[PDB]
Amino acid sequence: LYFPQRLYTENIYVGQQQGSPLLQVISMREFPTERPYFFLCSHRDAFTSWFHIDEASGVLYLNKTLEWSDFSSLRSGSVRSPKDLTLKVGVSSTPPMKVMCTILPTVEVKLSFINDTAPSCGQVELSTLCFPEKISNPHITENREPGALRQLRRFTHMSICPNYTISYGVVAGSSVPFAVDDSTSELVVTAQVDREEKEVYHLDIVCMVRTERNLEEVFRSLHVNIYDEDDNSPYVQGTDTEDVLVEFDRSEGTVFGTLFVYDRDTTPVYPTNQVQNKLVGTLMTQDSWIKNNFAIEHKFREEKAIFGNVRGTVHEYKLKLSQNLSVTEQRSFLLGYLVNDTTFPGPEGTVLLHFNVTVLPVPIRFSQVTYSFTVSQKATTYSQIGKVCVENCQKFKGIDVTYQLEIVDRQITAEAQSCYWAVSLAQNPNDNTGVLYVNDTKVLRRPECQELEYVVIAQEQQNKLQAKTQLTVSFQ
Amino acid sequence: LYFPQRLYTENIYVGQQQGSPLLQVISMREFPTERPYFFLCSHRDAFTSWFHIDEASGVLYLNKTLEWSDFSSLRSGSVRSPKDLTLKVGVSSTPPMKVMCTILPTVEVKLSFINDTAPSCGQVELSTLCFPEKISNPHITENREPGALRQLRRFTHMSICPNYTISYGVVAGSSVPFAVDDSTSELVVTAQVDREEKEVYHLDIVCMVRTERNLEEVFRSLHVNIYDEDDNSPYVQGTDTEDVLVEFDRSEGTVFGTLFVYDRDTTPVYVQNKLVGTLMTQDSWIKNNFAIEHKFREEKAIFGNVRGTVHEYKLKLSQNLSVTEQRSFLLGYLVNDTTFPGPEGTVLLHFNVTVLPVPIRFSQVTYSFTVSQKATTYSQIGKVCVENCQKFKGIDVTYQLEIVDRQITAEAQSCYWAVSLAQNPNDNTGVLYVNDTKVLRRPECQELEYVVIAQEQQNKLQAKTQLTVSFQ
Numbered sequence: 001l002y003f004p005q006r007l008y009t010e011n012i013y014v015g016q017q018q019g020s021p022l023l024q025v026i027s028m029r030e031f032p033t034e035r036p037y038f039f040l041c042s043h044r045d046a047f048t049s050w051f052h053i054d055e056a057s058g059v060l061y062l063n064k065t066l067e068w069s070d071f072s073s074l075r076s077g078s079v080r081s082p083k084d085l086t087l088k089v090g091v092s093s094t095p096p097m098k099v100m101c102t103i104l105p106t107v108e109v110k111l112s113f114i115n116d117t118a119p120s121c122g123q124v125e126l127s128t129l130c131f132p133e134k135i136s137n138p139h140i141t142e143n144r145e146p147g148a149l150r151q152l153r154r155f156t157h158m159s160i161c162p163n164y165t166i167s168y169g170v171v172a173g174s175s176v177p178f179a180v181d182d183s184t185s186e187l188v189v190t191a192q193v194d195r196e197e198k199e200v201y202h203l204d205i206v207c208m209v210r211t212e213r214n215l216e217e218v219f220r221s222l223h224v225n226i227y228d229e230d231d232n233s234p235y236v237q238g239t240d241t242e243d244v245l246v247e248f249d250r251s252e253g254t255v256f257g258t259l260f261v262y263d264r265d266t267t268p269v270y271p272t273n274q275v276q277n278k279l280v281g282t283l284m285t286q287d288s289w290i291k292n293n294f295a296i297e298h299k300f301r302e303e304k305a306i307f308g309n310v311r312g313t314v315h316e317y318k319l320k321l322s323q324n325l326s327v328t329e330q331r332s333f334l335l336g337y338l339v340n341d342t343t344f345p346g347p348e349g350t351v352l353l354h355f356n357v358t359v360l361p362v363p364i365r366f367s368q369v370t371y372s373f374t375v376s377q378k379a380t381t382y383s384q385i386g387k388v389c390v391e392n393c394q395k396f397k398g399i400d401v402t403y404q405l406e407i408v409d410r411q412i413t414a415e416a417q418s419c420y421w422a423v424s425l426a427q428n429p430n431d432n433t434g435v436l437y438v439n440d441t442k443v444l445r446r447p448e449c450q451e452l453e454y455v456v457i458a459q460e461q462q463n464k465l466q467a468k469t470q471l472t473v474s475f476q
Numbered sequence: 477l478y479f480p481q482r483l484y485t486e487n488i489y490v491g492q493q494q495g496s497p498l499l500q501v502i503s504m505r506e507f508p509t510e511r512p513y514f515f516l517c518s519h520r521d522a523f524t525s526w527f528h529i530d531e532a533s534g535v536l537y538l539n540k541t542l543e544w545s546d547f548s549s550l551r552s553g554s555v556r557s558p559k560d561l562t563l564k565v566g567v568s569s570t571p572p573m574k575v576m577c578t579i580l581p582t583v584e585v586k587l588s589f590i591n592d593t594a595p596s597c598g599q600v601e602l603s604t605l606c607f608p609e610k611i612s613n614p615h616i617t618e619n620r621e622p623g624a625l626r627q628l629r630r631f632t633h634m635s636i637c638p639n640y641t642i643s644y645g646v647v648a649g650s651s652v653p654f655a656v657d658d659s660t661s662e663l664v665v666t667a668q669v670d671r672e673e674k675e676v677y678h679l680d681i682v683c684m685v686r687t688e689r690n691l692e693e694v695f696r697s698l699h700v701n702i703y704d705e706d707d708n709s710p711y712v713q714g715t716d717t718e719d720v721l722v723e724f725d726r727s728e729g730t731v732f733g734t735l736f737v738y739d740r741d742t743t744p745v746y747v748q749n750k751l752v753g754t755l756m757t758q759d760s761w762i763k764n765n766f767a768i769e770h771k772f773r774e775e776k777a778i779f780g781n782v783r784g785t786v787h788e789y790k791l792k793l794s795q796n797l798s799v800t801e802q803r804s805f806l807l808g809y810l811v812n813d814t815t816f817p818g819p820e821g822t823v824l825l826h827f828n829v830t831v832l833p834v835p836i837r838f839s840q841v842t843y844s845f846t847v848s849q850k851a852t853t854y855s856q857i858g859k860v861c862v863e864n865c866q867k868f869k870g871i872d873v874t875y876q877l878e879i880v881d882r883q884i885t886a887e888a889q890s891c892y893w894a895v896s897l898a899q900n901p902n903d904n905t906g907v908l909y910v911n912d913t914k915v916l917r918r919p920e921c922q923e924l925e926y927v928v929i930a931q932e933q934q935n936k937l938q939a940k941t942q943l944t945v946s947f948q
């Protein structure tokens with residue numbers, strides 16, 4: 001059972017008689033043998049015993065003839081007319097119990113108690129007799145059993161105008177799965193519908209009234225919203241496999257591959273707790289190295305243009321690094337990822353995704369070309385002289401290399417050790433590059449201090465791998 | 477003219493005699509008829525008058541027979557020994573003049589004056605007869621003259637073993653453009669070289685020593701570096717045109733495409749081989765909204781055996797484009813290799829830009845949420861989102877809830893305290909949450925109806941849809 005309508009409304013008047021019908025609450029069956037049992041739930045309120053709902057038909061009736069004192073005694077806190085009354089109506093597929101009112105779905109019946117006697121039939125405009133002032137739009141879910149949807153007669157007004165005949169119809173320009181049941185005056189849905197074909201049905205209702213004058217007609221435009229269920233399995237467009245190379249970029253959080261999965265069903269905006277149409281993924285590997293270093297990132301968003309202008313869901317799966325992978329690691333594996341549409345009925349609601357991963361090692365090493373820098377200008381403290389970099393260091397990401405200058409010859413006099421102050425080195429972690437700059441220019445005034453031979457030492461941090469190269473600086 | 481090596485070193489000994497050769501400074505020609513003129517530059521030092529260099533040959537000679545007194549009087553009182561002597565040698569393309577010592581490049585000659593006589597023949601290994609102690613790895617410039625690179629013979633030790641005859645040769649793993657001149661014992665480079673083909677050569681020098689009953693040989697490993705010149709023009713790999721679509725991401729700083737420009741030459745940051753670009757437009761609108769992002773790196777991997785330069789060009793936004801913008805233009809960008817001789821040092825890049833407006837509208841005509849009566853304060857109810865709002869960048873959209881029924885009593889108004897809305901600028905959504913649970917005890921407060929209004933900041937474009945919240 002579900003309710004195609006969350007709120008009912010009507011006016012009630014002083015002098016309205018015991019036993020007169022007010023409105024009909026509708027429950028739609030989710031299965032053909034399901035039978036509704038209606039009951040009132042507002043037993044917390046005193047006014048609820050002014051009313052009676054028929055357990056089988058769902059028609060709500062006055063249980064008491066309304067009086068002036070009934071109006072004035074409503075403790076709402078607003079002394080003004082009209083006083084709104086809110087009733088709760090419950091429905092169940094078994095015989096009703098008191099506790100269902102606290103625990104089952106209910107409908108709100110909002111009544112406006114007007115502190116006056118009912119209007120005379122000559123005082124009601126045909127449009128009001130025919131159709132509520134503001135018509136709320138019903139909703140049904142796709143793939144459901146046809147059934148009555150809305151009682152079209154205004155019960156209260158046909159008692160004001162008892163000598164009028166009133167019939168309703170669906171005006172069908174195109175063929176629509178909606179009609180009126182002439183015998184009950186209900187709008188009914190005549191077939192199962194498909195949210196993926198149409199999410200909103202526009203309807204024009206015609207009311208035909210035989211007056212003392214002629215047969216009159218009034219038209220009312222409304223529409224029915226179609227709710228979605230998970231009735232489409234996810235699928236890939238093109239490949240289910242993404243080739244991933246891990247080499248010079250090994251930094252955590254970087255994305256190395258992206259696979260897209262599509263689902264024609266809708267999903268609440270990401271991220272959500274709803275379980276309808278949720279896709280849950282699972283790494284298809286028992287392997288500690290893979291699990292502790294790699295991870296899949298899942299996101300989804302609504303799209304419609306790619307689905308033929310029908311709202312569905314686009315999923316993105318991205319292979320991510322958990323932590324900076326050591327430059328010595330080298331592995332090639334085919335990583336499966338099972339994507340399961342959990343609420344898709346039957347065992348065809350999954351897609352297997354594949355990440356074909358190549359992880360190459362990254363050597364730590366200078367080219368065999370040693371550096372020689374010539375400073376043809378008079379040295380100025382802090383002027384950059386040159387840069388040092390291991391092979392392909394400028395492509396590195398997630399690899400920390402630190403550079404150091406050291407003196408080539410060891411058995412060197414104390415005085416000769418000072419010529420090497422002329423140049424120093426700074427880390428440019430922007431690239432993992434080394435920047436040579438001038439330091440002490442005072443030592444350059446010595447002709448022996450104008451040709452410097454250094455060793456540059458690079459050190460990868462995670463594994464402590466070292467590379468060396470030679471470096472000469474000529475102050476000219 | 478250029479020096480293949482910037483520092484020479486040798487030993488000199490007590491008892492070494494006037495006129496004995498010590499070593500040979502090398503200058504490498506950059507034109508076929510260019511010739512070097514060598515000269516000593518050392519001014520104030522007393523030991524400079526001890527030496528002489530042949531202006532034509534570059535051979536440094538002793539101009540004085542070294543006595544014990546010469547050593548102890550050199551910087552008297554210093555306890556160092558040996559005592560290092562630094563000489564400066566200059567070269568010129570025309571007849572040397574005094575002023576040239578101040579304004580033309582020089583190499584340093586560092587002589588170690590040993591306070592002893594030379595070793596006897598029986599004391600030295602053959603390698604000290606053949607080679608200098610310090611290994612020096614020379615350099616040569618690509619696209620220059622072949623010629624003598626290094627004197628291999630060790631002049632100071634010639635007489636240490638008078639009956640030994642000494643000659644030299646080169647061996648490598650591959651064929652190499654290097655050889656020994658039999659007549660001068662010079663290592664020669666026999667061809668012009670191309671840095672782009674080979675950046676360093678690894679040679680083994682062989683010294684053949686003919687003793688009184690044997691032909692012996694000792695080896696020395698050497699490396700010759702090739703200095704890079706800007707002799708390659710930049711080029712594009714594949715297409716010189718990038719199609720760029722500006723839609724949902726329109727924030728300042730966003731990069732839209734990558735054009736790759738390659739240059740085989742190296743690029744020292746500290747003007748050689750520098751590529752400078754120019755925006756090919758006068759359009760005020762374009763310039764005020766777009767710039768070209770240029771980054772570059774040096775790389776051996778993409779070029780193979782020899783380091784080259786990779787440049788990346790990307791069209792970047794200078795500010796958030798209004799969602800109402802819509803225009804298509806073709807934007808040229810000229811990249812110039814400013815030190816490449818001739819007019820072929822430039823490449824024209826193109827950006828083919830389509831900028832599309834972004835509509836501000838709901839694609840869902842109704843949001844319906846169902847929440848527990850026992851729901852706790854601040855628990856998330858759901859999210860709303862204008863069409864494609866999760867792709868938005870540089871677009872400011874806010875969301876607001878409005879009550880539908882305006883003719884509402886004060887008591888019914890308090891029902892709408894149960895729900896509030898928070899902005900989620902991260903993904904451009906609004907977040908509904910539970911606010912006041914106390915009003916949920918009232919049956920009239922359990923079905924709420926709102927209008928959701930989204931408003932784009934710049935243009936005040938609005939979108940509106942229905943939202944219902946049901947407390948069950």
Ligand SMILES: *[C@@H]1O[C@H](CO[C@@H]2O[C@@H](C)[C@@H](O)[C@@H](O)[C@@H]2O)[C@@H](O[C@@H]2O[C@H](CO)[C@@H](O[C@@H]3O[C@H](CO[C@H]4O[C@H](CO)[C@@H](O)[C@H](O)[C@@H]4O)[C@@H](O)[C@H](O[C@H]4O[C@H](CO[C@H]5O[C@H](CO)[C@@H](O)[C@H](O)[C@@H]5O)[C@@H](O)[C@H](O)[C@@H]4O)[C@@H]3O)[C@H](O)[C@H]2NC(C)=O)[C@H](O)[C@H]1NC(C)=O
Nearest residue numbers: 014067068069071072078079080081082083114115116117
């Ligand atoms: C809901 O609707 C109620 C009924 O609607 C009215 O009657 C319908 C039949 C119809 O014609 C409709 O159009 C009418 O609006 C309405 O109740 C009405 O209230 C008024 C105002 O009080 C009242 O008129 C006064 O009646 C006094 C006493 O009358 C006696 O008889 C009536 C009914 O027969 C009873 O309700 C009364 O309780 C009495 O039994 C008269 O004395 C009065 O005349 C003079 O004095 C009053 C001063 O009274 C005011 O102060 C007292 C004390 O504080 C209050 O208790 C009282 O309510 C007044 O506010 C002065 O106002 C006069 O101008 C005059 O100076 C006057 O005639 C109607 O009789 C009464 N009708 C009915 C049927 O009871 C109610 O107000 C509506 N409520 C809302 C929220 O909309």
Ligand SMILES: *[C@@H]1O[C@H](CO[C@@H]2O[C@@H](C)[C@@H](O)[C@@H](O)[C@@H]2O)[C@@H](O[C@@H]2O[C@H](CO)[C@@H](O[C@@H]3O[C@H](CO)[C@@H](O)[C@H](O[C@H]4O[C@H](CO)[C@@H](O)[C@H](O)[C@@H]4O)[C@@H]3O)[C@H](O)[C@H]2NC(C)=O)[C@H](O)[C@H]1NC(C)=O
Nearest residue numbers: 853885886887889891892893894895896897911912913914
């Ligand atoms: C969120 O909920 C709070 C109330 O819940 C309390 O705060 C939560 C954050 C949470 O901690 C709960 O656990 C906690 O109980 C709402 O706050 C109330 O807001 C209303 C309206 O602003 C206030 O009522 C007004 O009070 C005014 C004087 O203070 C008075 O002038 C007003 O009357 C005027 O306006 C009304 C219509 O607005 C009109 O009908 C009148 O005739 C007159 O013109 C009105 O009485 C309450 O005092 C506030 N309560 C508290 C405790 O601060 C908050 O609004 C809500 N946020 C939402 C829904 O966005």
Ligand SMILES: *[C@@H]1O[C@H](CO[C@@H]2O[C@@H](C)[C@@H](O)[C@@H](O)[C@@H]2O)[C@@H](O[C@@H]2O[C@H](CO)[C@@H](O[C@@H]3O[C@H](CO[C@H]4O[C@H](CO)[C@@H](O)[C@H](O)[C@@H]4O)[C@@H](O)[C@H](O)[C@@H]3O)[C@H](O)[C@H]2NC(C)=O)[C@H](O)[C@H]1NC(C)=O
Nearest residue numbers: 490544547548549550552553554555556557590591592593
């Ligand atoms: C430069 O070097 C000389 C050293 O000359 C020699 O050659 C070098 C390579 C080394 O092998 C030295 O050991 C040699 O001496 C220095 O002059 C010498 O210094 C030493 C140490 O101070 C002196 O040794 C002294 O010798 C005294 C006696 O020596 C004389 O008399 C003996 C008689 O047996 C005779 O055999 C000898 O030849 C000397 O004529 C000895 O009593 C004393 O204890 C001390 O050991 C040596 O005498 C010095 N000169 C000579 C000619 O021997 C210089 O000082 C050094 N210069 C600098 C600036 O450091």
Ligand SMILES: *[C@@H]1O[C@H](CO[C@@H]2O[C@@H](C)[C@@H](O)[C@@H](O)[C@@H]2O)[C@@H](O[C@@H]2O[C@H](CO)[C@@H](O[C@@H]3O[C@H](CO)[C@@H](O)[C@H](O)[C@@H]3O)[C@H](O)[C@H]2NC(C)=O)[C@H](O)[C@H]1NC(C)=O
Nearest residue numbers: 717718719720721722804805806807826827828829830831
């Ligand atoms: C500059 O770019 C436009 C637009 O290109 C479109 O948007 C970009 C962001 C890129 O992603 C492009 O891939 C994309 O198409 C170019 O005009 C466009 O040309 C294409 C053809 O290449 C048109 O597509 C269709 O092609 C089929 C052929 O199968 C035809 O039958 C269709 O009639 C249609 O031509 C596309 O419609 C067209 N777009 C517009 C707005 O005209 C443009 O050529 C390019 N200029 C360059 C590269 O110099």
Ligand SMILES: *[C@@H]1O[C@H](CO[C@@H]2O[C@@H](C)[C@@H](O)[C@@H](O)[C@@H]2O)[C@@H](O[C@@H]2O[C@H](CO)[C@@H](O)[C@H](O)[C@H]2NC(C)=O)[C@H](O)[C@H]1NC(C)=O
Nearest residue numbers: 241242243244245246332333334335354355356357358359
């Ligand atoms: C998984 O990938 C390997 C290697 O793929 C290479 O590296 C990727 C990062 C990507 O750039 C691919 O295009 C590369 O080819 C595949 O093995 C290679 O397959 C190609 C096919 O033409 C072949 O030319 C190579 O020789 C192969 N290399 C090796 C080392 O075998 C492999 O087939 C992929 N596996 C699956 C199941 O897709």
Ligand SMILES: *[C@@H]1O[C@H](CO[C@@H]2O[C@@H](C)[C@@H](O)[C@@H](O)[C@@H]2O)[C@@H](O[C@@H]2O[C@H](CO)[C@@H](O)[C@H](O)[C@H]2NC(C)=O)[C@H](O)[C@H]1NC(C)=O
Nearest residue numbers: 381382405419420421422423424425438439440441442443
């Ligand atoms: C850098 O040089 C200093 C000496 O020069 C000072 O620093 C320069 C960068 C510049 O600011 C000058 O004007 C300064 O006078 C070296 O400092 C010496 O370090 C050694 C050993 O660490 C120590 O024995 C000396 O006493 C220090 N002398 C002074 C004056 O500080 C420093 O080592 C150099 N750092 C390098 C080369 O990395």
Ligand SMILES: *[C@@H]1O[C@H](CO)[C@@H](O[C@@H]2O[C@H](CO)[C@@H](O)[C@H](O)[C@H]2NC(C)=O)[C@H](O)[C@H]1NC(C)=O
Nearest residue numbers: 280282338339340341342343344346347349350
């Ligand atoms: C996909 O998810 C569904 C949802 O739970 C799984 O369906 C259950 O599978 C278990 C066995 O693993 C059965 O005992 C249940 O009866 C199944 N239905 C349920 C729980 O509603 C399904 O197995 C998953 N498919 C996979 C992992 O391939």
Ligand SMILES: *[C@@H]1O[C@H](CO)[C@@H](O[C@@H]2O[C@H](CO)[C@@H](O)[C@H](O)[C@H]2NC(C)=O)[C@H](O)[C@H]1NC(C)=O
Nearest residue numbers: 250251252322323324325396397398399400429
């Ligand atoms: C993984 O690599 C990144 C980038 O190379 C490292 O990031 C730096 O980490 C140090 C560690 O103290 C910080 O001081 C720096 O501020 C970080 N800089 C940047 C740009 O990220 C990171 O530390 C490495 N390891 C981990 C576990 O993050």
Ligand SMILES: *[C@@H]1O[C@H](CO)[C@@H](O[C@@H]2O[C@H](CO)[C@@H](O)[C@H](O)[C@H]2NC(C)=O)[C@H](O)[C@H]1NC(C)=O
Nearest residue numbers: 752754810811812813814815816818819821822
């Ligand atoms: C590419 O860059 C070169 C080098 O800057 C430009 O050549 C110079 O242009 C100026 C401007 O007229 C002249 O005065 C110089 O004589 C030119 N040569 C040098 C060495 O500066 C050249 O114009 C640029 N090419 C383009 C197409 O803009």
Ligand SMILES: *[C@@H]1O[C@H](CO)[C@@H](O)[C@H](O)[C@H]1NC(C)=O
Nearest residue numbers: 048049050051052053063064
């Ligand atoms: C109608 O009201 C009377 C009270 O006068 C009560 O006894 C009876 O049970 C009520 N009927 C219904 C259906 O609520």
Ligand SMILES: *[C@@H]1O[C@H](CO)[C@@H](O)[C@H](O)[C@H]1NC(C)=O
Nearest residue numbers: 121122159160161162163164
């Ligand atoms: C309806 O018609 C009957 C019979 O003609 C008449 O008795 C009754 O009063 C009429 N009712 C109205 C509201 O006109």
Ligand SMILES: *[C@@H]1O[C@H](CO)[C@@H](O)[C@H](O)[C@H]1NC(C)=O
Nearest residue numbers: 597635636637638639640688
């Ligand atoms: C070299 O050989 C000759 C014999 O031909 C011999 O007389 C001489 O002493 C040897 N040594 C030197 C240093 O000449």
Ligand SMILES: [Ca+2]
Nearest residue numbers: 194195196231
């Ligand atoms: Ca469907």
Ligand SMILES: [Ca+2]
Nearest residue numbers: 228229231265
């Ligand atoms: Ca569906």
Ligand SMILES: [Ca+2]
Nearest residue numbers: 230232263265
């Ligand atoms: Ca689905």
Ligand SMILES: [Ca+2]
Nearest residue numbers: 670671672707
């Ligand atoms: Ca070249």
